Paper text:
Neurexins (Nrxns) are a representative presynaptic organizer family and interact with several different postsynaptic organizers such as neuroligins (NLs), Cbln1–GluD2, and leucine-rich repeat transmembrane neuronal proteins (LRRTMs). LRRTMs are potent postsynaptic organizers that have been shown to instruct presynaptic differentiation. LRRTMs have a leucine-rich repeat (LRR) domain in the N-terminal extracellular domain, which is followed by a single transmembrane domain and a cytoplasmic region. Here, we present the crystal structures of human LRRTM2 LRR domain alone and that in complex with human Nrxn1β LNS domain at 3.15 and 3.4 Å resolutions, respectively.
We consequently obtained diffraction-quality crystals of LRRTM2 (residues 34–371) with the T59L mutation (LRRTM2T59L), which should prevent the attachment of N-glycan at Asn57. One asparagine residue at position 57 is located in close proximity to a crystal contact, which appears to be inhibited by the attachment of N-glycan at Asn57. The interior of the convex face is stabilized by a Phe spine structure, which has also been found in other neuronal LRR proteins such as Nogo receptors, FLRTs, and Slitrks, suggesting their evolutional relationship. The repeat structure at the convex face is partly distorted at LRR7 and LRR8. The convex side of LRR7 forms a short helix and protrudes to LRR8. LRR8 lacks a phenylalanine residue involved in forming the Phe spine. Instead, two phenylalanine residues of the LRR7 convex side are found in the Phe spine by occupying the Phe-spine residue position in LRR8. In these crystals, the C-terminal caps of the adjacent LRRTM2 molecules extensively contact with each other. This contact seems to be stabilized by the intermolecular hydrophobic interaction between Trp333 and His355, which possibly inhibits the co-crystallization of LRRTM2 and Nrxn1β. Therefore, we conclude that the intermolecular contact found in the crystal of apo-LRRTM2T59L is not physiologically important.
Residue numbers in the entry: 34 to 361
The structure:
């Protein structure tokens, strides 16, 4: 066992040492390697050539800025690779292609601005992919073609401006998708057509104005949709016909004015809803919603208050409806 490193087994724990590069190990058959919280700034070719048998490799919390071609070559048995909390901004197209058994890949908290379309090719056994807290602006149509077994994808806290129109291919088994805290403007739910195993979709804290659906299709597996804190003011009358089994819908902190009876008649499988913090107009228009709320038997965590007109401001939707004879 190499200097400054304590080894519990064939696993090597070299965290918090004053390391500036990967150490040469006498023992080459190590199963794991942890180099957390060091001062590594660069990953060389075949740096891990000695550690062929490595199954997990932790390199988080380093100052890594440059990753050479073939940095991870020869690591066929590696199934977890953590590279979060570094200064990575470019990755060569061949950088992961040898990691054929990889299962968890973590690249969050890096300075990535774009990704080579073929970056993740051949990562068939990948299950979770963490790309949170990066500066990505776009995402290649062909990027996820091969993630045949991915079921968790995190693209939150980035700078995504748009969603590619024809491209979620290869994510047929994905269950949970995080797109929160980006900069999306519109949502066309037809764009998610390929994700036919999704249970949960997080879209909170974007800049979404519109909710539309261009294709008529049925998303039977979607059960939770978090749209909290957007700028939604308009919704196409069929976007929820698409989600018959939707059970949790959160639309707090938006700019919703009203909800059509056509919309609400498609939200009958809900068990939890969120409509607080909006711009509701307590006029004759709100009857569809008022009627829906009384009929409802599920949860809402925060009271849903009227915004307009001035003499209804701050009052419960139902209290205002029955108080002021707005409906029926
Ligand atoms: C990888 O990117 C480099 C750009 O430096 C390019 O020359 C090379 O052809 C690419 N390889 C593949 C397989 O696309
Ligand atoms: C959303 O659609 C409405 C009407 O369909 C339109 O007024 C508005 O410009 C659209 N929003 C965007 C961001 O294009």
């Amino acid at each position: 066992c190499p200097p400054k490193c304590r080894c519990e087994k064939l696993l090597f724990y070299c965290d918090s040492q004053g390391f500036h590069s990967v150490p040469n190990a006498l023992d080459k058959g190590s199963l794991g390697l942890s180099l957390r919280h060091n001062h590594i700034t660069e990953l060389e070719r075949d740096q891990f050539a000695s550690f062929s048998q490595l199954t997990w490799l932790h390199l988080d919390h380093n100052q890594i800025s440059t990753v050479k071609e073939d940095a991870f070559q020869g690591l066929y048995k590696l199934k977890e690779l953590i590279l979060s909390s570094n200064k990575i901004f470019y990755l060569p197209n061949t950088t992961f292609t040898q990691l054929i058994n990889l299962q968890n890949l973590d690249l969050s908290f890096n300075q990535l601005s774009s990704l080579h379309p073929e970056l993740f090719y051949g990562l068939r056994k990948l299950q979770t992919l963490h790309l949170r807290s990066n500066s990505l602006r776009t995402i290649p149509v062909r990027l996820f073609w091969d993630c045949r077994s991915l079921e968790f994808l995190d693209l939150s806290t980035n700078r995504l401006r748009s969603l590619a129109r024809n491209g979620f291919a290869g994510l047929i088994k994905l269950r949970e998708l995080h797109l929160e805290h980006n900069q999306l403007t519109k949502i066309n739910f037809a764009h998610f057509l390929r994700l036919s195993s999704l249970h949960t979709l997080f879209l909170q804290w974007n800049k979404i104005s519109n909710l539309t659906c261009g294709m008529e299709w049925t998303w039977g597996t979607l059960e939770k949709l978090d749209l909290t804190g957007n700028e939604i003011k308009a919704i196409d009358l069929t976007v929820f016909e698409t989600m018959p089994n939707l059970k949790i819908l959160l639309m707090d902190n938006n700019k919703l004015n009203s909800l059509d009876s056509k919309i609400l008649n498609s939200l009958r499988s809900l068990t939890t809803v969120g409509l607080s913090g909006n711009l509701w107009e307590c006029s004759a228009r709100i009857c569809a919603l008022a009627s829906w709320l009384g009929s409802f038997q599920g949860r809402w965590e925060h009271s849903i208050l009227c915004h307009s007109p001035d003499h209804t401001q701050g009052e419960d939707i139902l209290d205002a409806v029955h108080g002021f004879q707005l409906c029926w």
